[PDB]
Design a protein around this ligand. Structure first.
Ligand SMILES: O=C1Cc2cc(Nc3nc(Cl)ncc3F)ccc2N1
Ligand SMILES: O=C1Cc2cc(Nc3nc(Cl)ncc3F)ccc2N1
Ligand SMILES: [Cl-]
Ligand SMILES: [Cl-]
Lengths: 124, 4, 124, 4
């Protein structure tokens, strides 16, 4: 087509979606990771994760307001990945990289799994 | 704005 | 912080949100613009438009599944702006610029109003 | 990935 494109649009949309999350505006699901609860927007979770895409396209699961993750999932790892979904920034540290990578494999977030593998290889 |  | 950032994340999120819209997945509102109907995600509309942000933060309107726009709004202008919200690309043409600018003023989409004003000034 |  002959469209023009606003470079910062996608980043500005994501910043506003994170502001809605902060303010608990139109959040429509609670993700439970053992004793912790995280509120989010189903559409953002599906846009970032192959696991959430599969969950919320299922005719029965699409209607659930609570999703319980596998008990082996680390809540801090999940929190770091949820923040990445809404900001593009990943708080990857020596003390959390194994939990973050394991969580990203489970959630099916291939670009995160890729940077974790590279950071681990560099330390070996 | 740019030409994509 | 000491975060790393994935450059293409926000663009990839927006592309996936547009794929959900295409496929009518988790759309939760119908916007009526006279005889036409447009399905969308409330969160994407709020993230892009000051008018939708005000509508869906209202304690009564947040619960509506149908929103009727002012009868003066042009459906093609709205369609072009809805496509911009989900893609960052604006199909601005000599034959539609006046309707697009009027719609962007109503929806409170300041960056679009800005490029329309500039394109109009260049033709004068 | 970059340093933001
Ligand atoms: O590593 C990843 C990240 C990821 C996100 C999605 N999300 C969607 N995919 C499509 Cl094709 N349309 C809409 C979506 F919301 C699916 C798979 C995967 N795998
Ligand atoms: O031209 C524009 C585009 C636009 C979008 C929004 N959206 C939100 N603003 C904030 Cl601060 N937090 C969350 C949001 F969804 C508000 C006003 C305006 N004016
Ligand atoms: Cl990813
Ligand atoms: Cl805008």
């Amino acid at each position: 087509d002959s469209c023009i494109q606003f470079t910062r649009h996608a980043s500005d949309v994501l910043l506003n979606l994170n502001r809605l999350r902060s303010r608990d505006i139109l959040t429509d699901v609670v993700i439970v990771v053992s004793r912790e609860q995280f509120r989010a927007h189903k559409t953002v979770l599906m846009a970032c994760s192959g696991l959430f895409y599969s969950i919320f396209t299922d005719q029965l699961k699409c209607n659930l307001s609570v999703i319980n993750l596998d008990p082996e999932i680390n809540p801090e790892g999940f929190c770091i990945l949820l923040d990445f979904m809404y900001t593009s920034r990943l708080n990857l540290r020596e003390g959390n990289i194994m939990a973050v990578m394991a969580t990203a494999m489970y959630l099916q977030m291939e670009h995160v799994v890729d940077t974790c593998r590279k950071f681990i290889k560099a330390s070996e | 704005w740019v030409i994509p």
